[PDB]
Amino acid sequence: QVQLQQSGPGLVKPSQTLSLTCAISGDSVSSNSAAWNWIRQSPSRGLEWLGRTYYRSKWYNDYAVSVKSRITINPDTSKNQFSLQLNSVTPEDTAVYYCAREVTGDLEDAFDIWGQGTMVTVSSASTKGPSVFPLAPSSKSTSGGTAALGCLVKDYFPEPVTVSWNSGALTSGVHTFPAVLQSSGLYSLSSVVTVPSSSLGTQTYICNVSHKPSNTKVDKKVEPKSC
Amino acid sequence: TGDIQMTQSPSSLSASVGDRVTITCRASQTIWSYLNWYQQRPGKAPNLLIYAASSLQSGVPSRFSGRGSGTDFTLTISSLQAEDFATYYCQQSYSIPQTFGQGTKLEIKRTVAAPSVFIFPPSDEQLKSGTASVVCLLNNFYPREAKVQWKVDNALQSGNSQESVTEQDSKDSTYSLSSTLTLSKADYEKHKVYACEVTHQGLSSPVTKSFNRGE
Amino acid sequence: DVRVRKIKPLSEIHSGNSVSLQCDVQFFWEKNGRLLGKESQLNFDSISPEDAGSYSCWVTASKAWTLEVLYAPRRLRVSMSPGDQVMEGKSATLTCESDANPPVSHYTWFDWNNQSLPYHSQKLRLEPVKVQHSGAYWCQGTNSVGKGRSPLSTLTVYYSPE
Ligand SMILES: *[C@@H]1O[C@H](CO)[C@@H](O)[C@H](O)[C@H]1NC(C)=O
């Protein structure tokens, strides 16, 4: 199984340089039957190929002319990774950056393995970690044999916040809403889940809030209330 | 001639479960069979659906099919399923730079579904900070049109709430809405009744979910 | 009633085949204003792409019939722009000149070690070129009939005078 893991700061100050990394598992960056690309996506412009690096007998590079002056995609043979560097970033560079393996056969040429993505925001503002508050289940959040509960993730910057329930073991009935923008410039979202009311006394429900641009990992247990 | 430009049609389309849907992609220059189709589900990376115009990627269901060569291509879903709610992209690999289409948003029509309304008082932990957030939840409704009104002590609120709706659900094609009334701790404790009135097409009459600050 | 058919090959007129046709007394053939045979059938031992053209007979004149020869890509050469001497850090474009019928569907590029490179079009842009990229390169064309190889054309990358 081939997998790609991305890492790098999601908040870059203007005129400074973006730097991301894509770690490869189940394959080697020196593969002569593949190429390792970087593709960015934004609601402004959609999916745009940025560049790639590959090895045959030497190391080569193909770059989009949009970023030819600022892009740099270097492989790492010792750690089995390849990097993306973009000098002199602007707020226009705010987008989600994907790494992907390009199977480069004679007739098949596609991006078959993609990384998870890394949202990068270009802004002068400082990073702010979120504050997680429980949305405890109650009689006013219960109808029939179904109870609703969740977590409130308030006042963070920049996007995004990822939320999982019970470290991934609880997925059915989960709704994580898109972030709202407050007058403050900070973001906020809520993640809810509907569970049977009969098992509120025996099951444990923990929300796992993740905010990578601030190194924030918070797990809050949502306890029921009579009220 | 320059960079090969891909244009998809339609830009968006609505369809019900089981319907036949087709997405067309045209290249400005000929690319032979160096075309790929991707599916991007909400919050996920693009997923390779079809490579070399007509060959199905491993694991992709058989309802997806591709056709064409040269400049005109077609992606077909013979019987649409609720899991297929996504944006679909075509991409050419014949010439550098490789370019994608603008995408096709696929939305799922389905029957009317009334929302389940829940309300959450502010947590005691947030009240220590100095502000109070009252959250009202609209769960699994269709269609998208839903009006949320906040009423504190029967007085309609204005300018202190924020809404946010989800994308269509992967299983039942429904929407969920989260409305957050944000007040200061001082403004919160000076009132008692906090209500959330919801009017939707699936409801015979507006539904109000309320609570008392004391209880 | 005067006309010409292609008896002897089913169809698929390829350069290796022994091609023919006959006219349907005193026979005469003609291509490009010159008579090529006084027999009923005008036949070739091994057809070459330049034998293709518009033929005619008369015993009264036939109507023009165009012989079309399909062949694998031939006479392939790797052109280089601005040239085979490119400074490091700039662009070197390799064009795979070809001649085929039908034209080349897809190309294949190799290096000196016969490693395939991830390009499929007729032109390949190396940018930015490095001095390590100096070496021999060659392309390959493909169509309905067969394949075609080009000789080893080398590209040299020199440093900048600073
Ligand atoms: C590369 O392939 C060509 C044609 O198949 C052959 O003539 C040549 O010797 C090969 N070179 C190497 C290094 O294998």
Residue numbers in the entry:
A (entry chain H): 1 to 35, 35A, 35B, 36 to 52, 52A, 52B, 53 to 82, 82A, ...
B (entry chain L): -1 to 213
C (entry chain U): 507 to 530, 539 to 573, 580 to 682
What do the authors report?
Cluster of differentiation-22 (CD22) belongs to the sialic acid–binding immunoglobulin (Ig)-like lectin family of receptors that is expressed on the surface of B cells. It has been classified as an inhibitory coreceptor for the B-cell receptor because of its function in establishing a baseline level of B-cell inhibition. Genetically modified T cells with chimeric antigen receptors (CARs) derived from the m971 antibody have shown promise when used as an immunotherapeutic agent against B-cell acute lymphoblastic leukemia. The CD22 ECD is composed of seven Ig-like domains (d1–d7) and contains 12 predicted N-linked glycans.
To delineate the m971 epitope at high resolution, we obtained crystals of the membrane-proximal domains d6 and d7 of the extracellular portion (ECD) of human CD22 (CD22d6–d7) in complex with the m971 fragment antigen-binding (Fab), which diffracted to 2.4 Å resolution. As predicted from the primary sequence, the two consecutive CD22 d6 and d7 Ig domains possess a C2-type Ig fold, each with one intradomain disulfide linkage (C529-C517 in d6 and C616-C659 in d7). In the cocrystal structure, CD22 residues 574 to 580 located in d6 could not be built because of apparent high flexibility in this loop. Only one of the two predicted N-linked glycans in CD22d6–d7 was visible in the electron density and was built at N634 in d7, with one residual N-acetylglucosamine moiety left after endoglycosidase H deglycosylation of the recombinant CD22d6–d7 expressed in HEK 293 GnT I−/− (HEK 293S) cells before crystallization. The cocrystal structure revealed that the m971 Fab binds to the base of the CD22 d7 domain. The three heavy-chain complementarity-determining regions (HCDRs 1, 2, and 3) and the light-chain complementarity-determining regions 1 and 2 of m971 interact with the C β-strand, and loops C–E and E–F of CD22 d7. The buried surface area on the antigen is extensive (990 Å2) and is primarily mediated by the heavy chain (722 Å2) and less by the light chain (268 Å2). As opposed to mAb epratuzumab, in which the epitope includes an N-linked glycan at position N231 on d2, m971 does not include the N-linked glycan on d7 (N634). Three strong spherical electron densities close to positively charged surfaces on the CD22 d7 domain were observed in the electron density map. Interestingly, SO4 III is located at the interface between the basic patches of the CD22 d7 domain and the m971 HCDR2 and is stabilized by one hydrogen bond with the amide backbone of m971 WH55.
